[PDB]
């Protein structure tokens, strides 16, 4: 199913480019790991790497341009209305085409940005979240699963 992964600050002001406001009543916390706040804490990246391991990643063009090189050993799927500008990754012109390009896999990872997260959140089954404190440090990694009726 579809999963989102994101890093969220505690007192965030949510506009269009941000991870959406999600309804806590609709999400079950299934894993929570708290840790010491450390500057440039290396575990932040390791968390992303572990959780995206060997899964297709979908991202919007802005996010693609902020990263700039393909995440290795992952099909990298970039959403853009325009023809692609990097032959190392897969380019698609709609959400449906992005899902289609992933094939039959156990899990699809959406890695941002705000416009892309907003379109995929309503179809998502899991969230992988890094919670960030008032001076920009992670303090907790969390996995949530969507609550079904
Ligand atoms: N909290 C987190 O962990 C996290 C993670 C990653 C990124 N981010 C933030 O997200 C920011 C980017 O957010 P963003 O909203 O500006 O951009 P974004 O979602 O990365 O990219 C938006 C671009 O993707 C393409 N796109 C999106 N939906 C589409 C659709 N349905 N059909 C076709 N193309 C589509 C469009 O590209 P064209 O203009 O080419 O048509 C659009 O301009 C970054 O600056 C970063 O700071 C946060
Ligand atoms: Cl939600």
Numbering used by the authors: 1 to 149
What do the paper's sentences say?
DHFR (EC 1.5.1.3) is a ubiquitous enzyme that utilizes the reduced form of nicotinamide adenine dinucleotide phosphate (NADPH) to catalyze the reduction of 7,8-dihydrofolate (DHF) to 5,6,7,8-tetrahydrofolate22. DHFR is an essential enzyme, and a clinically relevant drug target that is inhibited by the antibacterial compounds trimethoprim and methotrexate. Here, we examine whether it is possible to rearrange a protein structure with newly introduced amino and carboxyl groups. This process can be described as “protein rethreading”, where instead of threading the protein according to its linear sequence, the polypeptide chain makes alternate connections at suitable junctions that may be available in its three dimensional (3D) structure. For the rethreading process, we selected dihydrofolate reductase from Escherichia coli (wtDHFR), which has been shown to tolerate a variety of circular permutations.
We determined the structure of rDHFR-1 to 1.60 Å. The space group was identified to be C2221, and two molecules were found in the asymmetric unit. All new loops made the designed connections and the rethreaded protein maintained the overall core structure of the native protein, except for the sites of the alternate loops, as expected. After structural alignment with the wtDHFR, an RMSD of 0.88 Å over 116 residues was obtained for Cα atoms. One NADPH molecule was bound to the A chain, but none to the B chain. Interestingly, no NADPH was added to the crystallization trials, and the NADPH observed in the structure is apparently a result of co-purification. A part of the NADPH binding site in the B molecule was observed to be involved in crystal contacts and thus this site was not available for binding NADPH. Comparison between rDHFR-1 and wtDHFR gives an RMSD of 0.92 Å for all the atoms of the NADPH molecule. Although, the exact reason for the loss of activity is not determined, the movement of the NADPH, and specifically the motion of nicotinic ring is a likely cause. Additionally, rDHFR-1 did not show reducing activity towards dihydrofolate (DHF).
